């Protein structure tokens, strides 16, 4: 294998410090995940003894947080549009850390209608004019405190219009925050404020 030490790499002015204790077991690193977006597989391996680090391969889904509240919802990752550095990881569609991935916009719609009674996004009327079962679970009037609690609530549904265009189309972007190669998950959060409006210039203008 190849170790992760300084066995290579001539010292600071050019010359070659040659050998000095050829090899050690602990000082090595293994071949990486290279996790394509797939159908959710996983593998177990020994680490430095006792610890069980879990890597990911051929992964499908994950749970992803929200910005202004920290609302973590699990949903199927659809696809990818962008990775941060290696375009030769973009084209093969490989799951890495904090790359620009589009996910779902589905479960955040139904989860939020307690606080965000106005449904996000605006679904098409004349084919979805029937409710299965939307309009009753929006308000219901409750004859009680919770609808009255939702009156001083829904004062925070002043969200960004760009995701409101994106929620009504049903494909939101997000940023997978955790490490795929340390715990075997795809855990993240939606980019909302400033890097959301930034990276579309990195995508739609380069489209």
């Amino acid at each position: 294998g190849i170790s992760r030490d300084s066995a290579h790499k001539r010292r600071a002015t050019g010359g070659k410090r040659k050998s000095l204790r050829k090899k050690r077991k602990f000082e090595l690193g293994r071949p990486a995940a290279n996790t394509k977006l797939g159908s959710g597989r996983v593998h177990k391996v020994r680490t430095r003894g006792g610890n069980t680090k879990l890597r990911a391969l051929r992964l499908e889904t994950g749970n992803f947080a929200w910005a202004s509240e920290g609302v973590a919802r699990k949903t199927r990752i659809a696809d990818v549009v962008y990775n941060a550095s290696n375009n030769e990881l973009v084209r093969t569609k490989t799951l890495v850390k904090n790359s620009i991935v589009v996910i779902d916009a589905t479960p955040f719609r139904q989860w939020y209608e307690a606080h965000y009674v106005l449904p996000l996004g605006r679904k098409r009327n004349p084919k979805h004019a029937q409710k299965e079962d939307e309009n009753d679970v929006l308000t219901k009037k409750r004859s009680e405190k919770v609808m009255k609690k939702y009156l001083e609530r829904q004062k925070y549904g002043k969200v960004e219009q760009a995701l409101e265009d994106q929620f009504t189309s049903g494909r939101i972007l997000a940023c997978i925050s955790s490490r795929p190669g340390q715990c075997g998950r795809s855990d993240g959060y939606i980019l909302e404020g400033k890097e959301l409006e930034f990276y579309l210039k990195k995508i739609k203008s380069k489209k």
Binding site: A67, A84, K158, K202
Partner: peptide, 15 residues
């Protein structure tokens, strides 16, 4: 070519 931000802060807006 990516975005740079100091990690550990978020725009939390209303609540």
């Amino acid at each position: 070519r990516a975005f740079q931000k100091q990690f550990g802060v978020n725009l939390n807006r209303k609540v």
